[PDB]
Each structure stands twice: as C-alpha cells, then as structure tokens.
C-alpha cells in the first residue's frame, strides 16, 4: 500500500515521505513584511532541511464589516508573489474565491487553494479543476473525514488529479474546535491515499500550537500548514492564531525530530 504522490515542482508531497511545510503569513499586508516573513522561513527551512512552500492570502472574504481591509487584490497580489519567487526561489500557495481567479493565479503560483466555506462549490471547483494546477482542499469543520472522497472525485472529473487535503479541526459544540487525530487515516483511505496535511494554526481559531502540532506529526503526515507573525500580540485580531517568528526554528526542530522518527517506523498492525 503505497501513498499517492503529488509533486509541486521539485517537491514531492506524500504521506510516507518527509513532511513538507506550507508555512507563511495570513494576509499580504505589505511586501516589506511579506519579504521579512518569507525571509525567515526559507533561512530556517534551508538550514534545517525541510521542503517549504510559502503561503499568503491576497484576499479576504471572511473579514467583518465592509469598511475593512479586503486585501491587496488579485491584480496587485500576484505581483507580490513574482518578486518573492525571484528573490527567494520558493513556491507560493494562495487560496482564490471566485471561479475566474483560478487561471490567473495558476500561472503566478505553484499550489492554489480551495477554502473550506467553498469546498462544496461545484462551479469554483470545476474551474479550479481546469487549471490543472495542484490543489489543497481545506476540510470544512462541519464535514466528517470520510466524506472527503466526493471532493477528490469531483476534481478527478474536472481532469485534476493533483490534490492535497488539509485538516483544520471539527466543530465541538458552540464556538470551538477539536482535532480528531483519527480522521487523518480516514482521510488517507477514502482519498486514494492522497497527501494529508494539518493546519495547526486554524485548528486553534496560543502556547498550545506546539503540543498540538507535535501530536499531529506523531500520527504521520504529508505536511504541516502554519502561519506566523513578527508581533502576534499587538497585531492580534481574529480568524487564526499565528506563531511567533522568532520561535519558528526551535519549533520546527520539534516537528522534524518527530516526523523523521515516525516516518521511519516498521509498519505496525494493531489490527490483529
């Protein structure tokens, strides 16, 4: 039973391979910031030996009250990824929202992304299916792990067969999330063993990020999705919860030590 491999350029994402890191920032506030964030990951990844795919949103549909920061915009966001690609030579992953945006971004970036709230959006999926580019389906909090087959299927049909599934926790009562460590296996299985990744920062709507991401890794995953900010405190708002840049390295040492140890175990069968 081999794992499906979805490659992003010279990067091979798979459940038995060493974990990739889809780190980055939440939104593209400014390049002076993006560049600084994207500067620390690369340096750290490169130094520690972990594949990496910078991530950032050039748009926001989940903000509150219209008189707010939408984001750079598709036309001004794409321009920012360009400069980063050249200056750093790393892959870019971003999310989309409308069926049209799909192709534009596909050119500019390596791994596009389907938001949870839109996971069941046939039109936007088919249109994202066209591009042929790699896809990251974030798993809605209101959907059980064993249903991710339909989304992978609807994508195959669209002609696209390069998909990663991302988990960000499940609804646990009112206003709360809990990550079921058992849904990872369920997702691998119903997905033709497609790559599964953990979005730790989303799963935490704290000093908790670490303990949770260790757990996630010990299960054995293809990747790890995360976000960080130079100054979480003052720039704190809502949505996710970023990691403190200055802690990137000592945190990622934890992951590798886990991901390497685990990715190298003699297959076990508690089944019988």
């Amino acid at each position: 039973m081999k794992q499906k491999v979805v490659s992003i350029g010279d990067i091979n994402v798979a459940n038995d391979l060493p974990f990739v890191l889809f780190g980055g920032m939440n939104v593209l506030e400014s390049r002076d910031l993006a560049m600084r964030i994207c500067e620390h990951y690369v340096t750290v990844t490169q130094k520690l030996g972990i594949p990496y795919v910078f991530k950032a949103s050039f748009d926001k549909a989940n903000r509150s009250s219209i008189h707010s920061y939408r984001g750079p915009g598709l036309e001004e966001g794409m321009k920012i990824f360009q400069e980063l690609k050249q200056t750093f030579g790393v892959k870019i992953i971003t999310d989309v929202h409308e069926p049209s945006q799909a192709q534009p971004v596909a050119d500019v970036v390596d791994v596009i992304q389907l938001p949870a709230f839109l996971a069941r959006q046939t039109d936007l999926v088919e249109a994202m299916a066209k591009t042929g580019a790699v896809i990251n389906v974030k798993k809605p909090q209101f959907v059980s792990p064993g249903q991710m087959g339909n989304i992978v299927d609807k994508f195959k049909e669209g002609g696209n067969e390069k998909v990663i599934l991302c988990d960000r926790g499940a609804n646990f009562g009112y206003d709360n999330l809990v990550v079921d460590m058992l849904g990872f296996s369920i997702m691998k299985k119903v997905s033709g063993n497609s790559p599964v990744i953990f979005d730790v920062t989303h799963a935490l709507q704290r000093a908790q990020v670490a303990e949770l991401a260790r757990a996630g890794m010990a299960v054995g995953l293809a990747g790890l999705f995360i976000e960080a900010h130079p100054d979480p405190e003052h720039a704190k708002c809502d949505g996710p919860s970023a990691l403190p840049l200055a802690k990137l390295e000592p945190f990622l040492k934890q992951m590798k030590a886990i991901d390497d140890l685990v990715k190298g175990f003699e297959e076990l069968d508690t089944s019988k």
Copy 2:
C-alpha cells in the same frame, strides 16, 4: 420590547405576529411540477389562513459530481417564477450564489436568500445589500446563534435593513444535526429582534418533521420554512428531506393551532 417587522409586500414578518410559511420545493425540476406543488400550498394556506411565500431553487451548487443537474439556470429560472406570480399571485423566495445574480433576481422575486456556506461572503452580501430587497440569512450549522449579529450588521451597512434569520440546526458530532430550541431567543436578541424562522426540513438532513416543527412553533417564531414533494420515496436523494404534499394540510393545522395558541400568551418571566 416590540419585534422588528420586515414586510414582503402585503406580508408582515415578525416574531410576535402570526407565523408566515415559506413553503415550496427544493429545486425547479419542471414547471409542470412547480405549478402542481405551488398549487397545493396556496389552496391550503388560503383555506387555513396562513401567509405564504412559495420557495424554490433555480440553481444548485451543493450537488455531487459535475455531470449532474445544475438546475434550470438563472435566465430560465426567473421565467418560471413569472408565470407563477401571475397564475397564483403569491410571493417567490429563491437563494442566489454569485454577486451578479443578486439584482436580476431582486426584480423577479420578493425575498432573496443567502445560503449558509456563503453566509460569510462579504462580496456576495454587499452585492445582495445593494438590491435593497428582503433577505433571508440561513444560519450556518457551524456558527453559534449569538454570532448572527455580524451578518445583520454587515447588511445594515450595505444599506439593507430588511432581514430574516433562518435556523437549520447545529453540528452535533460527525454527520448529524440537532436543533437547539434555545438559540431562537439568542438570535432574536442579538438581531435587534429581527424575524427568526425555522427550516425544519433542512434540520433533518422523516416521520420526524412533525414532532420537530411542533417544538419549533411552541417556542414562538416568525415563520416556518419547509419543502415537500408529491412522491418523496422514489424521488428521494439527499440534501434535505421533503414533506409529503398530501399531508401538507393536516400538518399545517398542527402549526396554526400551536402558533396561534402561543402567539397569544400573557408574556411570561421565569427570569425572576
């Protein structure tokens, strides 16, 4: 403490007023069917004395595998509502999906509708806000009742202040819904006491529809959302669960008897 009133033509929707009924069908399969469904409600409502606003989807973004029935289409769906308006003189409520569709439908229909998965879609909301038409915000299953203030707010700003909130249950573990009868009050409160309605058929992903809709009514609501089909059995699929047409009347007698009794109680205060 008076209830906000949102009127749909000669219809006044409010939490203390007699409940309106936003009945209808799921999708617009064919007019030969729509007409027959819409024919039984009217006859029954008119005979029993309950306000009514036919409902039906001219589109479907929540189906499975692209090679499926999208639906009539916006351009061919609107045409169907026309004929119904004339032939029956009843109001039409439909849902939308993309920011552009908003205005077109606003002309053709009385009460437009914001789908749950898109509830937090600022662009589609602002664009739905423009129309100025009445709005029905379906409450996502993954959002607590006390958060419906933000959606009502984002609509006020868009200039729209004629909104109804619709409840369809909350996530209870994997693949299941439970309706919290207490979230109705919480929603009234944080919504400037906007009209609250219960989508019983959605809340049931059975011979259960009745007991659940009675409960809902006994709490005291502005309205009741429902769907029915001539032959539920054979045409059974998934998504919601329709009511059997031939049972519309004896079922709605239950509601009125409840809605009237309750809507006429001396305000009680178990508070102290």
Copy 3:
C-alpha cells in the same frame, strides 16, 4: 400502537394521557420550606387540573468539597415525606444512591429514582428492581436515546416492569447541554413505549425554562419534571436551575394549553 401505562397509585403515567407533573424542590433543606413549596404546587395543580407527584432529594452525592451539606439523611429524610403525605395527600418521588437504601424508601415513597451517573449501576438497579416500586431512570447526558432499551431490559429481568424514562439533555461540546427534541420518539420506541418525561430544569444546568418546556410539551410527553424555589436569586448555587414559585401557575397554564391541544391531535404520518 398504544402506550404503556405505569401507574403511581391513582395516577396513570403514559405518553398519550394528559401529562403528569413531577414538580418539587432540589434538596430537603428544611420542612418549613418543603411544606411551603409543596403547598404551592398542590394548590396550583389541584386548581389547574394536573396530576402531581412532589419531588425532593434527601441526599446529595454531587456536591463539592466534603465539608458541605450532604442532606437530611435517609433516616431523617423519610420522616419528612411522611408528614407531607398526611398533611397534603400527594405522592413523593425521591432518588437513592446505594443498593441498600432502595427498600427503605420504597415503603415511604411512591416513585423512587435512579440517578444518571448510576444509570449503569447493575447492583443498585437489581436492588431497585427488587422493591417492585415504580422507577424513573434519568437519561445520562452521555448516552444516546436509542440505548435506553438496555436499562429498561435490565429492570424487566430484576422483575420490575414499571419504569419511566427521564430526559435531561445531551452533551454539546465542553460544559453545555442541548435537548434533542427527536430523542423522545427514539426513547418511546426502544422502550416498549414506556412513559417519557422531560427534566427541563436539569437540561438547563433562566428566563429560558419556559420556551424550552413549551417545546418539550409540543412534542407530546407523558410528563414534566421541574424544580422551583421561593427565592432563586440569593439561594442560587449550581447543579440545576430552579423556577420562581410565584410563577408556577402562569407557567403551568402554558404547559396544559400545549399538552391538551397536542394530546388531542389526529395521529399524523409525515412518514409517507
């Protein structure tokens, strides 16, 4: 399909019969208080026309920190029910905790009660099964409605076949309860259609008691379990949440109006 009838003296408890009321207080603080509480129910029930079975605990195993009020005690509690029976001629329902207590109480009272935390206590059940007295099984918050067959079964075997099932809500995330209005039918069914009752005050760990108990009634139940206190505010602590005595009557008028209306509907079948 007739409902099983479990009679408590001249009282017949059943799902199609008019609802009984198992009202009362939480603990037996003092007779000067018990008597006053038990005095208002009787007067109100008798005046409104609702069967009634005073309820009160002579013991508490769910308190916090040992240096606390256990309660009157089994030997001094039973004595209190005596005086009430004579002075008022109403039935008494109390809960037990240890296998021995069963018989003693059975003599003194009409309806004994099995606590939730002990619902799965075979020894205490078998011993409660001996008495032959009526039983009220409170449904644990951590057990689904369709599992209440085993408890009813284990009681049949113990020779006891006079059981009522009481619902008090289900766990919804951390520290919260939600009442699934659909579990009532599920419980009737798997219980040989035994009597089902709603413990509204427990289901609320407020000015909410009313809306929730209406919902419960509109479903159609055998009974209603409740608690009240002269002064909820100052004597507020935790565990349940009592109703304000002075509101007993106007509240119970709501129930009857509901329970009577509903208990007299032409059987409906939304099934087909």
Copy 4:
C-alpha cells in the same frame, strides 16, 4: 515550574519523567490467563526499559443484563493479585465501586482507581481518601478538562494527595468519542501539575490504537494506560478494545522512542 511527583513504591510518576505504563487486561477472567498476560508485559517492559503497573478488574458494574459475568469478586480477586505480586514482583492497579471495598484493596494493591461514572461520588471518594493510597481518577467523558480541580481538591481534603488523572476522550455527538489533545495541558495546570495519563483503549470504545497513542505521547505525558488480549477477535465484546498481545513490544517501542525524544526537548514557548 516543576511537576508534582506521585510515587507508587520505587516508581515515580510525573509529567516530565519518563512515561510509566499501566498496562494489563480488562477483567480477571482466570489466573491461567491473567498470569499469561502479566507475563508478557513484564518481560517486554523489563526488556525495553519502561516502568510498569499491571492492571485488571476484579469486578464489573458496567456489564449488560444481571445474568452475566460480574467478575471474580473482591474476596476472590484480591487473592489473584497476591500470587502475581510474588511470582512477578510488579505493582497492581484495580478500580473499586463501593465505599467499603476501598480499604481491603488498598492493602492488597499499590494504585487503586476511581471509575468515571463515580468520579463525582463524594462518599466513595472520601472513603478512598482515607486509605491514603495512590489514586487514579478516570476523567468522565462528560466533563471538561478544566474541572478536574474539584476532584483533586475533594481528595486533598480527604487527606489524600497522591493522585493521577486519567483521560479517556470526550463525547462527540451520539455514541462516539474524540480525544482533545489540548485537554492534557489544561488538566496539568488545574491539578497542581499532578500526573496525567492517557487511556488509549478506552478512548476507542482497532488498527487505530497506535496512531492515537503516538499522538498522545508526543504531547508529553506521565503515563499510558492500555489493555490487551491474546485473541481480541473471538473474545471481542464491548466496552473497551484491547491490543493484540503479540504486538505489545513493537507498539511500545513506538511509545518510548516518542516519550524519550519528547521528554527531552528544550522547553518551548510559542506563547510569545
């Protein structure tokens, strides 16, 4: 911030120390079996270098229908632990149910245990508090992690201050459990940093045991609770789900490799 240490003889249980293993069987079917089970753990623990405390129930209050296997009995169960202590020189942990049983067992065993359903049983706690023996409080599935302070408190008062807290998952909808990997920290904190252990087999009401117990370990725990049976298949019933004896070793190598790696990390602070 040092961790509280609760020693069981020459064994020191603590959150920063290497994890102990409270393995064993579910019930004491027969000594010919107990001995064989207890024979494989010891051999494996001793060989791999992991502290160990055999565990087994001499009683069962959670079975179905009275005409069933209660268990050896307190008087005949204690006798079985004796023989094992001598023949193997390992500590025994068992659970109790009634206030009286407490002392008897305290003599015979090292670590007694408080069942979940009885966690809030003041009398049985105070009586278990007397013994002065080590205690293992299983965390009810219907209680949030931050409430385990009250149980630890009620025990301090009883004079007992040697307590371990055991986690077995939380209710997630109807008939299901999910382990919140974040509740471990919450429990340490509110417990004066008492030892926290994971009951993996209970948390699974499969070939899943492994992935879940890895996750648990990667968080960093004092211990690991488990059960196994020579032939899970044929002897399968319900309640927990045992591990296959023949897989004990290759499974426990996973844990140590995790528990050692993690227990030796430079304290991290994602907090700031």
